[PDB]
């Protein structure tokens, strides 16, 4: 299900893609709201209902990158402490949910990301177990 190999991976990997944040965090938004409307919709408080092809480089989105970057490097440093990773995903549950997120909206961004990170040496197949793993984490308390 989660093999020792497949979480090496995904630290290294994320190690990279943390060290590019700065610049790479504003792609995967980017990529994630081309690909799913209903998503870039969920954000209209944010940007002020200003069109998805005007966002990227706003301090919205530099915001929104750092809190995205904060919670994954708290999963990855906690994959063999299944006690912590589940306090921290049913805090992020229990926010979004608030929201009218579903859990549908949760698992295409956790797939936007597996394929986004094959930029920085990412295995899609060890970020789709990861990613499996902690939905079974999350949807329960959607
Ligand atoms: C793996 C997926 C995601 C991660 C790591 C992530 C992480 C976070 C974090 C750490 C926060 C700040 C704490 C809080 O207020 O909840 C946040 C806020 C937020 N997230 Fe997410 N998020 C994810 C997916 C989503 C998705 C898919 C949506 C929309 C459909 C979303 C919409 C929001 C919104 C609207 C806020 C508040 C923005 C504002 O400050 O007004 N997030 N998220």
Redesign the pocket.
């Known amino acids: 299900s989660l093999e020792a190999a497949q979480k090496s991976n995904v630290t290294s990997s994320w190690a990279k893609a943390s060290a590019a944040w700065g610049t790479a965090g504003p792609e995967f938004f980017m990529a994630l709201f081309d690909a799913h409307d209903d998503?870039f919709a969920?954000?209209s408080?944010?940007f002020s209902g200003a069109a998805k092809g005007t966002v990227k480089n706003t301090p919205e989105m530099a915001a929104?990158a750092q809190?995205?970057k904060?919670?994954?490097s708290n999963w990855v440093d906690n994959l063999d402490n299944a006690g912590a990773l589940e306090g921290q995903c049913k805090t992020?549950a229990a926010?979004?949910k608030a929201?009218g997120?579903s859990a549908g909206?949760?698992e295409a961004?956790?797939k936007v990301?597996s394929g986004f990170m094959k930029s920085y040496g990412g295995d899609e197949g060890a970020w789709t177990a990861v990613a499996g793993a902690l939905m079974g984490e999350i949807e329960p308390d959607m």
């Open positions: 998503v969920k954000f408080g944010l929104q809190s995205f904060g919670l994954v992020f926010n979004h929201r997120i909206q949760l961004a956790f990301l």
